[PDB]
Amino acid sequence: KIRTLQGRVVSDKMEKSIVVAIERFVKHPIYGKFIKRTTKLHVHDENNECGIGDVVEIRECRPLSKTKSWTLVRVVEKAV
């Protein structure tokens, strides 16, 4: 078991790379309402396997570029 996060692929244009929103459903500090917050992450994906809209599991790793410190581990729900 390794630490990993799931997220929808917000973009897949930059080659070998995808952007993966990691929406978390946090509670508001004061008002107590539960707000959908988002976390964009530049994820490395070799072979350009991922599509846009694709759900994808990712893990943290040594930084591969200026913005890219995550790698994909497995794709799920990769329908179009």
Binding site: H28, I30, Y31, G32, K33, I35
Partner: peptide, 10 residues
């Protein structure tokens, strides 16, 4: 409204 407060607090 709680939503309104979240949007624009007091």
């Amino acid at each position: 409204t709680v939503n309104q407060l979240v949007r624009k607090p007091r």
